[PDB]
Amino acid sequence: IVGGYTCGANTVPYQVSLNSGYHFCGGSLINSQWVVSAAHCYKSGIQVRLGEDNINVVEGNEQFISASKSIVHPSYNSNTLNNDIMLIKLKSAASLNSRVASISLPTSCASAGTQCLISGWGNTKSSGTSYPDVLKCLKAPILSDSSCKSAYPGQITSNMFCAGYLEGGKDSCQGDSGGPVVCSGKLQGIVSWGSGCAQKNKPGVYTKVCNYVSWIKQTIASN
Ligand SMILES: NCCc1c[nH]c2ccc(O)cc12
Numbered sequence: 001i002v003g004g005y006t007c008g009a010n011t012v013p014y015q016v017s018l019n020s021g022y023h024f025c026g027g028s029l030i031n032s033q034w035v036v037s038a039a040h041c042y043k044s045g046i047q048v049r050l051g052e053d054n055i056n057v058v059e060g061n062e063q064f065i066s067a068s069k070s071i072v073h074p075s076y077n078s079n080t081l082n083n084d085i086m087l088i089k090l091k092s093a094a095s096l097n098s099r100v101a102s103i104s105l106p107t108s109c110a111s112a113g114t115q116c117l118i119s120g121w122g123n124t125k126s127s128g129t130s131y132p133d134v135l136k137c138l139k140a141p142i143l144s145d146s147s148c149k150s151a152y153p154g155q156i157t158s159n160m161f162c163a164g165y166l167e168g169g170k171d172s173c174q175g176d177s178g179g180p181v182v183c184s185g186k187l188q189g190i191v192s193w194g195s196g197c198a199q200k201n202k203p204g205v206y207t208k209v210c211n212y213v214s215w216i217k218q219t220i221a222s223n
Pocket residue numbers: 171172173174175176177191192193194195196197198203204205
C-alpha cells in the first residue's frame with residue numbers, strides 16, 4: 001500500500017496473509033473455513049495466516065492453518081485477469097474472536113463514490129521497494145466505470161472496478177494482491193491489478209466481488 005497508514009494491530013480482523021515460506025498475497029476470511037483471494041495468487045502449499053499484524057514476529061493473536069483445497073474461478077483468464085478470484089478452504093476452522101473475524105459478502109454492488117478500506121503488506125513505494133512488516137491501510141473511493149475505462153482503455157470488464165485517486169500517490173501495490181476492499185462493512189473488491197502503483201491516471205483495478213456471490217455461496221455449500 002502506497003500512501004496509506006499503519007492500520008493498527010488486528011483492526012482489520014478479516015485480513016489474511018497467504019504464506020508459502022514468505023508472505024506473497026493477501027486474502028479475506030469470509031467464514032471460519034474459507035478465504036477469498038485473487039486467482040493470480042494461486043499456488044500449491046499455501047498456509048493461511050490469520051490474526052497477523054507484524055508478519056515477521058509472533059505477537060500472540062495468530063492462527064496458522066494449512067489450505068486443504070484451492071478453487072480458482074472456472075472462467076479466470078490470466079492474460080486479461082477477468083474473473084480474478086479464488087477460494088481457499090482451510091484444513092480446520094479458524095477460532096473467531098474480536099481480532100480474527102469474517103467479513104460479510106455484499107448483497108448489492110457498491111456505487112462509484114463509495115469510500116472503501118484497502119489493506120495489505122505490499123510495497124509502500126511507487127518507484128523502488130520497501131516492504132512493511134505491519135499491516136497498511138488506505139481509504140479510497142470507488143471510481144466511476146467511465147473514469148476507470150478512460151484510465152485503462154479496452155481492459156476493464158464488468159467484473160472489475162477502479163478505486164483510488166487519479167492524481168496518483170495512493171494505491172495498492174505488489175504484495176497487496178488478493179487482499180480486501182471493504183465498503184460499508186462488506187467485501188466489495190479484491191486487489192487484482194494496475195499499471196504500476198500510485199501512478200497518475202492509473203488507479204488500482206479490483207475484482208468486483210458482488211458479481212461472484214452466487215458462485216461463492218454454491219461453491220462453499222458443496223466443498
Ligand atoms: N494497484 C496495484 C495493483 C497490483 C497488484 N499486483 C501488482 C504487482 C505489481 C504492481 O506493480 C502492481 C500490482
